[PDB]
């Protein structure tokens, strides 16, 4: 299980202990919103009902995407505008670009540092 976390970021994100450990690592450097947003996108795509999709999409946008949002993720204006536009036309891949940018924010920086920290090394 712990081996999978370094073989694939996707395996780490599907692990109960992995996610908990990584969330704590991120919280100490004020970037846990990246992980919370990613996970929120994953549950969003499982929604079938049009009404729930609309409601959840608006909450996700207001909580993580719009300027000055409580847990605003570090995305450029280009992506924020794109997401809003997608929100305007109700598309299921509404958050794809934002999720991918946020994923890279983790995968190419905090993820590798997490693996080289006691939080991961002690569990290996």
């Amino acid at each position: 299980d712990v081996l999978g976390w370094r073989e694939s970021f996707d395996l780490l994100l599907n692990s109960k202990n992995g996610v908990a450990a990584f969330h704590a690592f991120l919280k100490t450097e004020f970037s846990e919103e990246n992980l919370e947003f990613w996970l929120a996108c994953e549950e969003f795509k499982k929604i079938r009902s049009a009404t729930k999709l609309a409601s959840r999409a608006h909450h996700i946008f207001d909580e993580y995407i719009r300027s000055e949002a409580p847990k605003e993720v570090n995305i450029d204006h280009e992506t924020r505008e794109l997401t809003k536009t997608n929100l305007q036309a109700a598309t299921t891949s509404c958050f794809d670009v934002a999720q991918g940018k946020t994923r890279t924010l983790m995968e190419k920086d905090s993820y590798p540092r997490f693996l080289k920290s006691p939080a991961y090394r002690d569990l290996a």
Side-chain angles (χ1 to χ4, degrees):
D1 177 39
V2 176
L3 190 176
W5 304 0
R6 57 203 234 306
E7 291 185 318
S8 169
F9 189 37
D10 295 287
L11 290 188
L12 173 62
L13 299 169
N14 184 198
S15 167
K16 163 177 147 56
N17 291 328
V19 172
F22 189 46
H23 187 271
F25 180 77
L26 295 182
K27 191 171 186 175
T28 68
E29 48 181 62
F30 303 83
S31 67
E32 79 274 13
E33 66 266 25
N34 292 329
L35 175 59
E36 295 174 351
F37 169 58
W38 190 91
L39 295 166
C41 289
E42 288 302 279
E43 63 172 315
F44 171 71
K45 285 196 175 179
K46 171 182 173 298
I47 302 178
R48 291 167 181 170
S49 169
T51 42
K52 187 180 178 181
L53 279 167
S55 176
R56 173 70 76 268
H58 283 147
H59 167 66
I60 289 177
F61 183 83
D62 292 344
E63 172 160 48
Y64 307 95
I65 306 293
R66 67 176 173 180
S67 174
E68 294 179 284
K71 295 173 179 175
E72 177 174 19
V73 297
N74 182 47
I75 288 306
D76 58 31
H77 167 69
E78 190 71 67
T79 308
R80 278 208 301 292
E81 183 53 47
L82 174 78
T83 304
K84 179 186 182 180
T85 295
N86 294 343
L87 197 72
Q88 310 301 61
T91 62
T92 301
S93 63
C94 178
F95 303 110
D96 279 27
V97 183
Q99 174 172 27
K101 296 296 185 180
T102 301
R103 180 194 173 106
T104 297
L105 222 49
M106 296 181 276
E107 196 165 38
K108 295 303 183 181
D109 173 43
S110 54
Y111 164 53
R113 287 187 291 97
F114 164 66
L115 298 179
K116 296 167 187 168
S117 73
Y120 176 75
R121 285 180 173 168
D122 291 351
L123 310 179

